[PDB]
């Protein structure tokens, strides 16, 4: 599953992604940690908030 | 550290 970024988000830890509107995050996994996803952007995997993105269906 | 559920 891929997601599209709907709202900008700035990483506040090194394991998070910084994401910008329009970007596509690839191969997204829903985490145990509620509200968070893990996925690949610019060839790097990291965590990002689920309410800043929309699942591409 | 814990992470919040960030708000737009």
Resolution, expressed in angstroms to one decimal: 1.7
Tell me which residue in A7, A12, A47 faces B8 most closely, judged by beta carbons: A7
**Could you list the residue range(s) of the whole structural domain that residue A45 is in?**
1-57
Structure tokens at A2: 């891929």
Could you tell me if A18 and A7 are in contact, meaning their C-beta atoms sit under 8 angstroms apart? no
Q: Which three-class secondary structure state does DSSP give residue B8? A: coil
- CATH classification at residue A12: 2.30.30.40
Domain tally for chain A? 1
Interface test with B, best of A6, A12, A14 (most B CBs within 10 A): A12
Q: CA–CA separation, B8 vs A55, rounded Å? A: 17
Q: What is the DSSP string of chain A?
A: --EEE-S-B--SSTTBPPB-TT-EEEEEEE-SSTTEEEEEETTEEEEEEGGGEEE--
Q: How was this structure determined?
A: X-ray
Q: CA–CA separation, A20 vs A25, rounded Å? A: 10
Task: Give the A-side interface with B, CB within 8 Å.
Answer: 7, 9, 12-13, 16, 33-36, 47, 49, 51-52
């Amino acid at each position: 599953v891929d997601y599209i970024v709907e709202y900008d988000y700035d990483a506040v830890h090194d394991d998070e992604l910084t994401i910008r509107v329009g970007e596509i995050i690839r191969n997204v996994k829903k985490l145990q940690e509620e509200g968070w996803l893990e996925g690949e952007l610019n060839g790097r995997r990291g965590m990002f908030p689920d309410n800043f993105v929309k699942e591409i269906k | 550290p814990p992470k919040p559920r960030p708000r737009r």
